[PDB]
Amino acid sequence: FNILLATDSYKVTHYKQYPPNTSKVYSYFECREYEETVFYGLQYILNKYLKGKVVTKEKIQEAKEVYREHFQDDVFNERGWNYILEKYDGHLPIEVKAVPEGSVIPRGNVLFTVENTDPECYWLTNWIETILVQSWYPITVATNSREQKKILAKYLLETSGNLDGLEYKLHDFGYRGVSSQETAGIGASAHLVNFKGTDTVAGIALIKKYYGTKDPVPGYSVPAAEHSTITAWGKDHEKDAFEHIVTQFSSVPVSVVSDSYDIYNACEKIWGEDLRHLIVSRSTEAPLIIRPDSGNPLDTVLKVLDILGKKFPVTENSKGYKLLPPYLRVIQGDGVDINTLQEIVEGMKQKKWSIENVSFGSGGALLQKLTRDLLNCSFKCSYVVTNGLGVNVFKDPVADPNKRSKKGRLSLHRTPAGNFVTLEEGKGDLEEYGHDLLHTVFKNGKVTKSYSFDEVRKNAQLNI
Amino acid sequence: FNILLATDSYKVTHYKQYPPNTSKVYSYFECREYEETVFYGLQYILNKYLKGKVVTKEKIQEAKEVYREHFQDDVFNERGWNYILEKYDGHLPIEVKAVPEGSVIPRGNVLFTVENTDPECYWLTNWIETILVQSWYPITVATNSREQKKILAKYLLETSGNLDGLEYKLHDFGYRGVSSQETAGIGASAHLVNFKGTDTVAGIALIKKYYGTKDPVPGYSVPAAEHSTITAWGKDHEKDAFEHIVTQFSSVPVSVVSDSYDIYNACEKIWGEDLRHLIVSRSTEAPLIIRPDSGNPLDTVLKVLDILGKKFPVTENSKGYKLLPPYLRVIQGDGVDINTLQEIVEGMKQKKWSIENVSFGSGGALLQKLTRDLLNCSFKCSYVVTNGLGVNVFKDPVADPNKRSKKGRLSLHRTPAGNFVTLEEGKGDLEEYGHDLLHTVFKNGKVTKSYSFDEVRKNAQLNI
């Protein structure tokens, strides 16, 4: 990996576009005005991509060649990178300040800032924009995942009286549905800020390498069937597949996909009649989890629950909501996103079904159907020093007031009523509020402030 | 990278779930039910992740450890992996057959197949589903991009005599809008199947390492300003910023973002009056490219063109469409996707503007807004051998006919009228439809057939 290469190609030419005698470029990141945002992921990028000796003579040579053919011209500035190699032993003369990892922060607030610490490296601030802006993805995943937890929290507490096992209510099925291997690890780790359930163990490895956990089980999964594992038995032998699978996993939880041919036949006749004797004997810590995977998500879940309620003992909990026996649950792992999740739990509630009966899985929508625009994650220059004089800078496009950026040196503060305010134009120096909530996390090639994933999770906790 | 870790965690348990006495699992990939897709990206995955000695004693031990805690139980199949290590020196006993890289194939067709070559490794076929299915992404990016090229082609041909410079009409701005560094490389490579413009040089690195090309210039970019290099001058000094940038890049094409404060003032007063004398002196090989970046994308382009047509000499084409001077062009890089691109170009046509005036740029919509659901990319088991008997296998959910999978052994064939058919149930063995269009590309740890990026581009050409 070459950091000289890991930027928007046109930024190669930017060192020549700044006002002459510019010694300082100061830039910031915000989720421009999902009213709250989980700040997560910078620490990964800092350690993996920016830390330590990132400049070498070889990497400078490679970039020279690569940009020579890309631009069909020598626009690449060797001198600027030679300077960093020679004066700082390839360590980047940059200071990064950020709110704590896991922080839940209202939109339109400064989340991190970037400035050069050496006047010669004024151009460096915006060179690393591209790599740092990719922090939008872990942020958006963690945020969207948290918003789903809120809906589940509301309805679980409504229908059961507590939040027991909330952190297991949404499983990450996103591995195959993401754009790459690196994305799966990043996105799975972000989901894990909020829940424990994941089919992507690369997320666990990212957590341990870059954050660290104390607790013994950072993320979990259970044995589960897939379509090939049922259909391989042949159309006429679905019961045989079911019986074989639950006996192989008699002592542990097992998820079994039940819609290969006819979900409602599988629930009523196979699970509820033919194999009913093998279900009712199961332990509370080893339920059968039936997984429908097609049709309208609400209509299916409702009819599934109706069928099971007619074949198995149903209790009514203290909140007046119907409950399956402890050895039998449902997972809805198809068509679940923040919108449909809400419709399912509400529909369940309306039909007097407790949310403890059903857990959820999401894939493409949880990890892939997300963009920069969702939270308007943006990096902008707000402050420069030219001819030894500070200048507050900004954009303010005439046709779009939502695209206006903040001016001058920024700081984040706690207000008297416990809310947040970003102070612009260096007004943080007035000390009318407490201290700036941003900490220096990176300075001169070194990570200077870090958080465990135990701290991240704690920071991202719901407010109950 | 450990291939034992790069699967959906539940698949670790599937060796215990297939019918006893299974010696073969045969699975296929399709874009189920955007009527035609570009098959691109499998070669990358095969070379990076699947070829050679991918199993070592250390990787088996790591997986053992990782999976023990993830499952709270020792379900990981150490026996199967040790067999591959010991018998095949860590090389995977699978055969993969695929349509040529770059192939444009209608929906509903088999694009690749996977099966084990050793009876003991029946479980291996679907172990690698997850990694292989991530093919969806370069496929979907290659397809959506090709579809955008078709719109541009249609309208360029309509308003101009021809297709000159089509391969430069859509620039990839997606680097900061994608989920990771790896995605940025894969996605930019996929765009480069159809166009030449990219700001992500990682796309070019992927090309050369994994496909290779004899073209001396596979991807390009030009000098471009960003908001920071304009705003850093101060609001009162936008003209100074413009003048400085165009003079620094007097002899090469330069893109200059012009909406910092007021796009329409920039075009009418700054470019059109104060700096007009610096623009009209430019070479045809070195135009000023004005970049609006806010407001309604069609309304802004139309007003920009109207303004510029009033300050600069306009000629009418042989096709009757209006044309800016060769030293002056526009790039629209905000809010562009397949739907809005069509609306912009149609609105331009209605106002008698040639498409040669405006080129485009897309970011998150081009490389990130896309999902596996867009082309229904899916991997399914279609055939097994149990007790030495072949079994044609499929799923067919009662509530969703669109989710039914294909049966038995598959082959892709040219029909007499020049179209495509996928033959199911081994029917390709009746030589009624010519040779199988799928070729073995991987067998027993070796890539057996590979394509240059020159072949990919040729294969993916538009049919004019």
Side-chain angles (χ1 to χ4, degrees), chain A residues 11 22 25 47-48 54 62 80 83 87 94-95 149 177 183 208 223 275 297 365 377 406 419 460:
Chain A
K11 288 172 180 286
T22 291
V25 174
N47 282 274
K48 183 175 184 75
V54 297
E62 179 181 22
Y83 179 82
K87 211 215 170 191
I94 278 293
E95 182 171 3
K149 199 172 164 187
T183 288
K208 298 185 179 192
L275 305 191
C377 308
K406 299 180 194 299
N419 300 303

PDB file of all heavy atoms in Angstrom, chain A residues 11 22 25 47-48 54 62 80 83 87 94-95 149 177 183 208 223 275 297 365 377 406 419 460:
ATOM      1  N   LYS A  11      -5.659  15.701  -6.905  1.00  0.00           N
ATOM      2  CA  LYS A  11      -5.031  16.338  -5.737  1.00  0.00           C
ATOM      3  C   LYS A  11      -3.502  16.378  -5.851  1.00  0.00           C
ATOM      4  O   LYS A  11      -2.833  17.085  -5.105  1.00  0.00           O
ATOM      5  CB  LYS A  11      -5.464  15.658  -4.430  1.00  0.00           C
ATOM      6  CG  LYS A  11      -6.910  15.946  -4.008  1.00  0.00           C
ATOM      7  CD  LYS A  11      -7.290  15.075  -2.818  1.00  0.00           C
ATOM      8  CE  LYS A  11      -8.717  15.314  -2.353  1.00  0.00           C
ATOM      9  NZ  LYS A  11      -8.837  16.606  -1.621  1.00  0.00           N
ATOM     10  N   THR A  22       1.216  30.116   1.577  1.00  0.00           N
ATOM     11  CA  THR A  22       0.319  29.410   2.491  1.00  0.00           C
ATOM     12  C   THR A  22       1.127  28.427   3.332  1.00  0.00           C
ATOM     13  O   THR A  22       1.828  27.567   2.798  1.00  0.00           O
ATOM     14  CB  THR A  22      -0.801  28.675   1.711  1.00  0.00           C
ATOM     15  OG1 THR A  22      -1.689  29.633   1.119  1.00  0.00           O
ATOM     16  CG2 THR A  22      -1.712  27.910   2.666  1.00  0.00           C
ATOM     17  N   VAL A  25      -3.028  24.664   6.251  1.00  0.00           N
ATOM     18  CA  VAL A  25      -4.347  24.297   5.758  1.00  0.00           C
ATOM     19  C   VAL A  25      -5.023  23.463   6.841  1.00  0.00           C
ATOM     20  O   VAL A  25      -4.503  22.428   7.265  1.00  0.00           O
ATOM     21  CB  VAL A  25      -4.296  23.571   4.384  1.00  0.00           C
ATOM     22  CG1 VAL A  25      -5.674  23.073   3.964  1.00  0.00           C
ATOM     23  CG2 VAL A  25      -3.720  24.502   3.308  1.00  0.00           C
ATOM     24  N   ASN A  47      -4.350   3.781  12.208  1.00  0.00           N
ATOM     25  CA  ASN A  47      -3.392   2.692  12.425  1.00  0.00           C
ATOM     26  C   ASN A  47      -2.984   1.926  11.176  1.00  0.00           C
ATOM     27  O   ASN A  47      -1.805   1.601  11.007  1.00  0.00           O
ATOM     28  CB  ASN A  47      -3.923   1.712  13.470  1.00  0.00           C
ATOM     29  CG  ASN A  47      -3.766   2.231  14.877  1.00  0.00           C
ATOM     30  OD1 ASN A  47      -2.718   2.069  15.497  1.00  0.00           O
ATOM     31  ND2 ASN A  47      -4.803   2.864  15.386  1.00  0.00           N
ATOM     32  N   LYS A  48      -3.950   1.625  10.307  1.00  0.00           N
ATOM     33  CA  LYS A  48      -3.667   0.813   9.125  1.00  0.00           C
ATOM     34  C   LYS A  48      -2.937   1.582   8.025  1.00  0.00           C
ATOM     35  O   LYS A  48      -2.035   1.040   7.387  1.00  0.00           O
ATOM     36  CB  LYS A  48      -4.946   0.189   8.558  1.00  0.00           C
ATOM     37  CG  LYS A  48      -4.710  -0.740   7.373  1.00  0.00           C
ATOM     38  CD  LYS A  48      -5.989  -1.418   6.944  1.00  0.00           C
ATOM     39  CE  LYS A  48      -5.744  -2.409   5.833  1.00  0.00           C
ATOM     40  NZ  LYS A  48      -5.093  -3.646   6.344  1.00  0.00           N
ATOM     41  N   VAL A  54       5.368   6.018   6.435  1.00  0.00           N
ATOM     42  CA  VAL A  54       4.482   5.718   5.305  1.00  0.00           C
ATOM     43  C   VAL A  54       5.088   6.168   3.978  1.00  0.00           C
ATOM     44  O   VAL A  54       4.605   5.795   2.900  1.00  0.00           O
ATOM     45  CB  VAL A  54       3.075   6.337   5.490  1.00  0.00           C
ATOM     46  CG1 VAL A  54       2.387   5.749   6.716  1.00  0.00           C
ATOM     47  CG2 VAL A  54       3.149   7.861   5.579  1.00  0.00           C
ATOM     48  N   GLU A  62       7.612   4.963  -7.255  1.00  0.00           N
ATOM     49  CA  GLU A  62       6.413   4.345  -7.816  1.00  0.00           C
ATOM     50  C   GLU A  62       5.374   5.403  -8.193  1.00  0.00           C
ATOM     51  O   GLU A  62       4.829   5.384  -9.299  1.00  0.00           O
ATOM     52  CB  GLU A  62       5.819   3.339  -6.823  1.00  0.00           C
ATOM     53  CG  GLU A  62       4.548   2.647  -7.297  1.00  0.00           C
ATOM     54  CD  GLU A  62       3.968   1.682  -6.273  1.00  0.00           C
ATOM     55  OE1 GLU A  62       4.251   1.815  -5.058  1.00  0.00           O
ATOM     56  OE2 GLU A  62       3.210   0.782  -6.685  1.00  0.00           O
ATOM     57  N   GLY A  80       8.135  17.774  -2.207  1.00  0.00           N
ATOM     58  CA  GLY A  80       7.297  17.745  -1.010  1.00  0.00           C
ATOM     59  C   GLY A  80       7.365  16.448  -0.229  1.00  0.00           C
ATOM     60  O   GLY A  80       7.379  16.460   1.009  1.00  0.00           O
ATOM     61  N   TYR A  83      10.969  15.843   1.228  1.00  0.00           N
ATOM     62  CA  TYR A  83      11.083  16.607   2.473  1.00  0.00           C
ATOM     63  C   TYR A  83      10.597  15.833   3.701  1.00  0.00           C
ATOM     64  O   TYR A  83      11.276  15.812   4.725  1.00  0.00           O
ATOM     65  CB  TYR A  83      10.341  17.952   2.358  1.00  0.00           C
ATOM     66  CG  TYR A  83      10.409  18.788   3.620  1.00  0.00           C
ATOM     67  CD1 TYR A  83      11.525  19.579   3.899  1.00  0.00           C
ATOM     68  CD2 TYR A  83       9.363  18.779   4.541  1.00  0.00           C
ATOM     69  CE1 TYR A  83      11.595  20.341   5.060  1.00  0.00           C
ATOM     70  CE2 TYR A  83       9.426  19.529   5.705  1.00  0.00           C
ATOM     71  CZ  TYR A  83      10.545  20.308   5.957  1.00  0.00           C
ATOM     72  OH  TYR A  83      10.602  21.058   7.100  1.00  0.00           O
ATOM     73  N   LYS A  87      13.077  14.839   6.612  1.00  0.00           N
ATOM     74  CA  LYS A  87      13.022  15.561   7.878  1.00  0.00           C
ATOM     75  C   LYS A  87      12.325  14.794   9.003  1.00  0.00           C
ATOM     76  O   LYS A  87      12.667  14.966  10.177  1.00  0.00           O
ATOM     77  CB  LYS A  87      12.423  16.959   7.710  1.00  0.00           C
ATOM     78  CG  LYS A  87      13.010  17.961   8.699  1.00  0.00           C
ATOM     79  CD  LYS A  87      11.989  18.979   9.166  1.00  0.00           C
ATOM     80  CE  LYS A  87      12.538  19.802  10.326  1.00  0.00           C
ATOM     81  NZ  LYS A  87      11.481  20.630  10.987  1.00  0.00           N
ATOM     82  N   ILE A  94       1.260  15.983  10.454  1.00  0.00           N
ATOM     83  CA  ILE A  94      -0.173  16.245  10.464  1.00  0.00           C
ATOM     84  C   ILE A  94      -0.677  16.087  11.896  1.00  0.00           C
ATOM     85  O   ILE A  94      -0.185  15.231  12.633  1.00  0.00           O
ATOM     86  CB  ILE A  94      -0.889  15.237   9.494  1.00  0.00           C
ATOM     87  CG1 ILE A  94      -0.798  15.706   8.032  1.00  0.00           C
ATOM     88  CG2 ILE A  94      -2.339  14.979   9.879  1.00  0.00           C
ATOM     89  CD1 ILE A  94      -1.570  16.974   7.701  1.00  0.00           C
ATOM     90  N   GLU A  95      -1.625  16.927  12.301  1.00  0.00           N
ATOM     91  CA  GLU A  95      -2.306  16.747  13.585  1.00  0.00           C
ATOM     92  C   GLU A  95      -3.773  16.524  13.333  1.00  0.00           C
ATOM     93  O   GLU A  95      -4.407  17.312  12.622  1.00  0.00           O
ATOM     94  CB  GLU A  95      -2.116  17.942  14.530  1.00  0.00           C
ATOM     95  CG  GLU A  95      -2.786  17.732  15.885  1.00  0.00           C
ATOM     96  CD  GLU A  95      -2.440  18.779  16.931  1.00  0.00           C
ATOM     97  OE1 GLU A  95      -1.705  19.734  16.620  1.00  0.00           O
ATOM     98  OE2 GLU A  95      -2.901  18.629  18.084  1.00  0.00           O
ATOM     99  N   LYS A 149     -31.617  -0.827  16.326  1.00  0.00           N
ATOM    100  CA  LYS A 149     -31.597  -1.229  17.737  1.00  0.00           C
ATOM    101  C   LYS A 149     -32.627  -0.481  18.574  1.00  0.00           C
ATOM    102  O   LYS A 149     -33.265  -1.073  19.441  1.00  0.00           O
ATOM    103  CB  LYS A 149     -30.194  -1.012  18.325  1.00  0.00           C
ATOM    104  CG  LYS A 149     -29.907  -1.803  19.620  1.00  0.00           C
ATOM    105  CD  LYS A 149     -28.444  -1.694  20.014  1.00  0.00           C
ATOM    106  CE  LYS A 149     -28.219  -2.132  21.463  1.00  0.00           C
ATOM    107  NZ  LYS A 149     -26.821  -1.858  21.908  1.00  0.00           N
ATOM    108  N   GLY A 177     -22.844  -9.832   0.355  1.00  0.00           N
ATOM    109  CA  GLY A 177     -23.590  -8.701  -0.194  1.00  0.00           C
ATOM    110  C   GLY A 177     -22.817  -7.399  -0.229  1.00  0.00           C
ATOM    111  O   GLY A 177     -23.320  -6.381  -0.716  1.00  0.00           O
ATOM    112  N   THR A 183     -14.189  -4.301   2.964  1.00  0.00           N
ATOM    113  CA  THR A 183     -15.472  -3.704   3.334  1.00  0.00           C
ATOM    114  C   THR A 183     -16.241  -4.569   4.345  1.00  0.00           C
ATOM    115  O   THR A 183     -16.851  -4.044   5.285  1.00  0.00           O
ATOM    116  CB  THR A 183     -16.334  -3.425   2.067  1.00  0.00           C
ATOM    117  OG1 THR A 183     -15.788  -2.316   1.336  1.00  0.00           O
ATOM    118  CG2 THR A 183     -17.713  -2.929   2.465  1.00  0.00           C
ATOM    119  N   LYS A 208     -10.115  -6.854  17.321  1.00  0.00           N
ATOM    120  CA  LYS A 208      -8.990  -7.264  18.162  1.00  0.00           C
ATOM    121  C   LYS A 208      -7.647  -6.631  17.752  1.00  0.00           C
ATOM    122  O   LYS A 208      -6.829  -6.280  18.605  1.00  0.00           O
ATOM    123  CB  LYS A 208      -8.897  -8.791  18.209  1.00  0.00           C
ATOM    124  CG  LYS A 208     -10.126  -9.438  18.826  1.00  0.00           C
ATOM    125  CD  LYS A 208      -9.980 -10.944  18.983  1.00  0.00           C
ATOM    126  CE  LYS A 208     -11.241 -11.512  19.641  1.00  0.00           C
ATOM    127  NZ  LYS A 208     -11.090 -12.921  20.091  1.00  0.00           N
ATOM    128  N   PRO A 223     -24.964 -22.562  14.488  1.00  0.00           N
ATOM    129  CA  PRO A 223     -25.190 -23.425  13.335  1.00  0.00           C
ATOM    130  C   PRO A 223     -26.461 -23.020  12.586  1.00  0.00           C
ATOM    131  O   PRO A 223     -27.492 -22.743  13.199  1.00  0.00           O
ATOM    132  CB  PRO A 223     -25.346 -24.814  13.961  1.00  0.00           C
ATOM    133  CG  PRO A 223     -24.548 -24.749  15.233  1.00  0.00           C
ATOM    134  CD  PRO A 223     -24.726 -23.341  15.723  1.00  0.00           C
ATOM    135  N   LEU A 275     -42.047 -33.838  12.755  1.00  0.00           N
ATOM    136  CA  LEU A 275     -40.832 -33.719  13.567  1.00  0.00           C
ATOM    137  C   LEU A 275     -41.075 -33.030  14.905  1.00  0.00           C
ATOM    138  O   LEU A 275     -40.134 -32.774  15.654  1.00  0.00           O
ATOM    139  CB  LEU A 275     -39.721 -33.006  12.781  1.00  0.00           C
ATOM    140  CG  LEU A 275     -39.328 -33.597  11.419  1.00  0.00           C
ATOM    141  CD1 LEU A 275     -38.071 -32.952  10.909  1.00  0.00           C
ATOM    142  CD2 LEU A 275     -39.145 -35.117  11.479  1.00  0.00           C
ATOM    143  N   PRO A 297     -42.343  -9.890   3.953  1.00  0.00           N
ATOM    144  CA  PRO A 297     -41.779 -10.129   5.299  1.00  0.00           C
ATOM    145  C   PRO A 297     -42.802 -10.105   6.446  1.00  0.00           C
ATOM    146  O   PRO A 297     -42.808 -11.024   7.265  1.00  0.00           O
ATOM    147  CB  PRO A 297     -40.739  -9.006   5.460  1.00  0.00           C
ATOM    148  CG  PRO A 297     -40.344  -8.658   4.074  1.00  0.00           C
ATOM    149  CD  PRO A 297     -41.607  -8.829   3.237  1.00  0.00           C
ATOM    150  N   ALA A 365     -28.685  -4.418   2.734  1.00  0.00           N
ATOM    151  CA  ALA A 365     -29.175  -3.158   3.281  1.00  0.00           C
ATOM    152  C   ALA A 365     -28.394  -2.687   4.528  1.00  0.00           C
ATOM    153  O   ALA A 365     -28.211  -1.486   4.733  1.00  0.00           O
ATOM    154  CB  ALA A 365     -30.671  -3.256   3.573  1.00  0.00           C
ATOM    155  N   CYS A 377     -21.761  13.055   4.930  1.00  0.00           N
ATOM    156  CA  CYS A 377     -20.411  13.039   5.467  1.00  0.00           C
ATOM    157  C   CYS A 377     -19.489  13.807   4.518  1.00  0.00           C
ATOM    158  O   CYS A 377     -19.362  13.455   3.333  1.00  0.00           O
ATOM    159  CB  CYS A 377     -19.928  11.602   5.661  1.00  0.00           C
ATOM    160  SG  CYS A 377     -21.052  10.532   6.609  1.00  0.00           S
ATOM    161  N   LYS A 406     -18.565  25.317   7.339  1.00  0.00           N
ATOM    162  CA  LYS A 406     -18.237  26.108   8.535  1.00  0.00           C
ATOM    163  C   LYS A 406     -16.973  26.954   8.329  1.00  0.00           C
ATOM    164  O   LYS A 406     -16.124  26.609   7.507  1.00  0.00           O
ATOM    165  CB  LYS A 406     -18.079  25.203   9.768  1.00  0.00           C
ATOM    166  CG  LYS A 406     -19.324  24.415  10.141  1.00  0.00           C
ATOM    167  CD  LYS A 406     -19.061  23.553  11.371  1.00  0.00           C
ATOM    168  CE  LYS A 406     -20.139  22.508  11.593  1.00  0.00           C
ATOM    169  NZ  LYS A 406     -21.499  23.098  11.826  1.00  0.00           N
ATOM    170  N   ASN A 419     -26.450  19.500  25.662  1.00  0.00           N
ATOM    171  CA  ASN A 419     -26.435  19.301  24.219  1.00  0.00           C
ATOM    172  C   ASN A 419     -25.062  19.630  23.637  1.00  0.00           C
ATOM    173  O   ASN A 419     -24.085  19.755  24.370  1.00  0.00           O
ATOM    174  CB  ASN A 419     -27.541  20.133  23.566  1.00  0.00           C
ATOM    175  CG  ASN A 419     -28.931  19.757  24.067  1.00  0.00           C
ATOM    176  OD1 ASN A 419     -29.350  18.600  23.966  1.00  0.00           O
ATOM    177  ND2 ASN A 419     -29.655  20.735  24.605  1.00  0.00           N
ATOM    178  N   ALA A 460     -21.396   4.183  22.575  1.00  0.00           N
ATOM    179  CA  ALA A 460     -22.500   4.037  21.617  1.00  0.00           C
ATOM    180  C   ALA A 460     -23.796   3.505  22.232  1.00  0.00           C
ATOM    181  O   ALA A 460     -24.793   3.353  21.533  1.00  0.00           O
ATOM    182  CB  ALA A 460     -22.077   3.147  20.458  1.00  0.00           C
TER     183      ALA A 460
END
